[PDB]
């Protein structure tokens, strides 16, 4: 068992000092209001997840009722509304091309829809099988390759055209529930119950780095725009930010009144902004460098489940459990 | 903006369909079945999960039958009733008791009532012999009373359990009616 001992000794050897001392020389972001400017209303039950398109104008959101709808955020009209074959969903995905939508959950079978059809209506273009656990994330990789994370302690990258699996990753001992894709679309980071965040390479299917900064679990995940760093949430009210080079935890956010779990995290183009949602009906906007509170974002009377900024970073959408979707700026 | 008006009309049609769907959804009540599960679902009627629709007394009920259940319970807050079925032929009985104790004390499953069901009474009577490993007894009626006594003791500590002896459709109907009546009474501060 000396391998882990020497690994941690080598890791601590390169960690001569933290970055807190040099971070004090930067100008604080100050207080930002970021009041709501739009409200998407019409959902029937609690919202589980939502996603933004590559055009940063349309978005897709699914609720507990059993239907997922696509809003046009600019003019508030609902572009699309599709009832799922089943009645349980957990996550949503918008393809970068904009012609496919992915979803999954308690059904344990992934569904891939085709928005741009010869007929006006849309149908289940592909039915994906091969998961023995509940789906958690279905982030799109390309028009034909999609990576998914389930509750069977393994994740899998599938090819839409052929139907069967292409790559499998079973490194995680616990059930992986968080999955984030890097902007380069080469490596993705996964997180499970056992306080473990692990890198995964699409081409090789062999994990590159492993992390154990958190304690309880990894129920939130995101990627830095730079691509060599990422931040993961936890039930311990902490969002530790790691890197792809030193494998050391950089930031540690603590606050005595939000001890509850953190559901989702996000970022911005500059990276000096971390939007994290909690169980106190608010999404505390945390500074990514000064490690202090920056925003409030108190506009929901129920628990926020999933939040995410747009591709251009011009707006922020927060999905809560009161069938209310709010756009912030 | 000629096509903007058509887009608004399409959105209005989608809103009308959503309103119809919301009326249908509010017309139905949702139940979560845990776990004799096959016999129970067969009686209710007359791959990973089972979703069932059944209408009785002009009231429509959805039924969802499903480590693993951490998130399943977590995202099932707004259910109306949780039916629990435990086999009395069983250890497995201790595991069921531990599961019930864990599920009863949840920080997010408050205000969700449960309905307890006891099955395989005939097999338990034929066996009578679980008293060897359970010395708290110190004939079949007394045995079943003893085996529900500690079950109720663990049950007690908003949500209320409804033990029953095993037809069941009317029992579920009455339990759901009582639960909704109590919820409405507490809404107006009458209970």
């Amino acid at each position: 068992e000396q391998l882990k001992n020497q690994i941690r000794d080598a890791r601590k050897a390169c960690a001569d000092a933290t970055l807190s001392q040099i971070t004090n020389n930067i100008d604080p972001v100050g207080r930002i209001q970021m009041r709501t400017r739009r409200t998407l209303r019409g959902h029937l039950a609690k919202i589980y997840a939502m996603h933004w398109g590559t055009d940063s104008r349309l978005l897709v959101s699914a609720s507990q009722d059993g239907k997922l709808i696509i809003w046009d955020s600019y003019t508030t009209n609902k572009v699309h509304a599709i009832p799922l074959r089943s009645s349980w969903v957990m996550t949503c995905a918008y393809a970068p091309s904009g012609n496919y939508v992915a979803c999954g959950g308690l059904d344990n079978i992934c569904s891939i829809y085709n928005l741009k059809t010869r007929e006006g209506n849309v149908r289940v273009s592909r039915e994906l099988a091969g998961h023995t656990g509940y789906l958690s994330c279905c982030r799109f990789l390309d028009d034909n390759q999609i990576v998914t994370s389930s509750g069977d302690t393994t994740c899998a990258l599938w090819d839409i055209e052929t139907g069967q699996q292409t790559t499998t990753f079973t490194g995680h001992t616990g059930d992986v529930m968080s999955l984030s894709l890097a902007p380069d679309t080469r490596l993705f980071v996964s997180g499970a119950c056992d306080a473990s965040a692990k890198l995964w390479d699409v081409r090789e299917g062999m994990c590159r780095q492993t992390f154990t900064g958190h304690e309880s679990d990894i129920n939130a995940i995101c990627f830095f725009p730079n691509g060599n760093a990422f931040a993961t949430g936890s039930d311990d009210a902490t969002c530790r930010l790691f890197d792809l080079r030193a494998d050391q935890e950089l930031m540690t956010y603590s606050h005595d009144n939000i001890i509850c779990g953190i559901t989702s995290v996000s970022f911005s183009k500059s990276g000096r902004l971390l939007l994290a949602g909690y169980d106190d009906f608010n999404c505390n906007v945390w500074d990514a460098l000064k490690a202090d509170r920056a925003g409030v974002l108190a506009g929901h009377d129920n628990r926020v489940s999933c939040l995410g900024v747009t591709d251009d970073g011009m707006a922020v959408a927060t999905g809560s459990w009161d069938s209310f979707l709010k756009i912030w700026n | 903006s000629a096509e903007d008006k058509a887009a608004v009309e399409r959105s209005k049609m989608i809103e009308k369909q959503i309103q119809k769907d919301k009326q249908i959804y509010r017309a139905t009540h949702r139940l979560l079945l845990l776990g004799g599960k096959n016999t129970i679902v067969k009686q209710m009627r007359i791959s990973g999960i089972f979703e069932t629709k059944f209408q009785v007394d002009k009231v429509n009920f959805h039924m969802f039958d499903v480590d693993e259940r951490r998130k399943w319970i977590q995202c099932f807050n707004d259910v109306t009733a949780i039916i629990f079925v435990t086999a009395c032929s069983s250890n497995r009985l201790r595991a069921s008791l531990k599961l019930f104790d864990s599920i009863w004390n949840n920080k997010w499953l408050r205000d969700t009532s449960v309905i307890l069901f006891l099955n395989k009474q005939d097999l338990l009577a034929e066996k009578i012999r679980l008293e060897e490993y359970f010395p708290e007894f110190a004939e079949v009626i007394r045995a079943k009373y003893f085996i529900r006594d500690e079950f109720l003791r663990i049950s007690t500590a908003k949500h209320y359990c409804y033990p029953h002896f095993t037809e069941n459709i009317r029992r579920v109907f009455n339990d759901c009616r009582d639960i909704i009546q109590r919820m409405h009474l507490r809404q107006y501060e009458l209970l």
Partner: single-chain antibody
Framework: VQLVESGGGLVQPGGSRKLSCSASGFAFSSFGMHWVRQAPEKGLEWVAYISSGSGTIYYADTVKGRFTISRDDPKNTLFLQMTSLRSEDTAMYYC??????????????WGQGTTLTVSDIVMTQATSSVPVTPGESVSISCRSSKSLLHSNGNTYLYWFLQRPGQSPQLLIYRMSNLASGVPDRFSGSGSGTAFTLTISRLEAEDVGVYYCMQHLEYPLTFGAGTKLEL
């Protein structure tokens, strides 16, 4: 998807005529529909339009009180009624579909068309017949009296190049986007008043007459068209 048109013939003037358009292959209930007319020696002229929900009904300015149009989703067939028709309607009618949402493709499919015989934005296509050579770039021009640029930023202009004998095929929609089935050699550009079509290479299928459509207001006036020969 298929569109079948029935009706027409030779009747006395000032009568009532029924035209039926049946759609087989797609759910036309959530589809706007348009009735257009084409004269034997002139271009197409917009007649009527019905929304998906049959809520708002619009009519051509030339004839308003002598036309009726309705649809029946369960019957999968829409009907058009002519009353007190004159002798000028010796035209062939096209029923077309159009779905309206963000990033949609209105007027995607055009019906076969059935023959029948007894203030507003206008376009002036100066060119009538310009011969072309194989493997040569072709430039077409459309001029609009009124600016087609809206506050949103999308110009509502469409191209409906008529093949010589069959129904029109949609080529460019909104002057910038690319249609589903069309060679990539076609390109469109403009500034708001003059719109240009550029063609790199042409073939036998490329032979046709190009039509110009505006969609900002609801005159729905067509252009003149340009003929090309090889």
């Amino acid at each position: 998807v298929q569109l079948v048109e029935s009706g027409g013939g030779l009747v006395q003037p000032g009568g009532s005529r029924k035209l039926s358009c049946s759609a087989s292959g797609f759910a036309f209930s959530s589809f706007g529909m348009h009735w257009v007319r084409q004269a034997p020696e002139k271009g197409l002229e917009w007649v009527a339009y019905i929304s998906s929900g049959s809520g708002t009904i619009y009519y051509a300015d030339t004839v308003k009180g002598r036309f009726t149009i309705s649809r029946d989703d369960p019957k999968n067939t829409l009907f058009l009624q002519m009353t007190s028709l004159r002798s000028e309607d010796t035209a062939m009618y096209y029923c077309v579909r159009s779905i309206y949402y963000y990033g949609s493709s209105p007027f995607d499919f055009w019906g076969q068309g059935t023959t029948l015989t007894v203030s507003d934005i206008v376009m002036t296509q100066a060119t009538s017949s310009v011969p072309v050579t194989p493997g040569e770039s072709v430039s077409i021009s459309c001029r609009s009296s009124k600016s087609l640029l809206h506050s949103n930023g999308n110009t509502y202009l469409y191209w409906f190049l008529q093949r010589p004998g069959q129904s029109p095929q949609l080529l460019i929609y909104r002057m910038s986007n690319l249609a589903s089935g069309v060679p990539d050699r076609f390109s469109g550009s403009g500034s708001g008043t003059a719109f240009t079509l550029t063609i790199s290479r042409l073939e036998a299928e490329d032979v046709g007459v190009y039509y110009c459509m505006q969609h900002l207001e609801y005159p729905l006036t067509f252009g003149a068209g340009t003929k090309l020969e090889l």
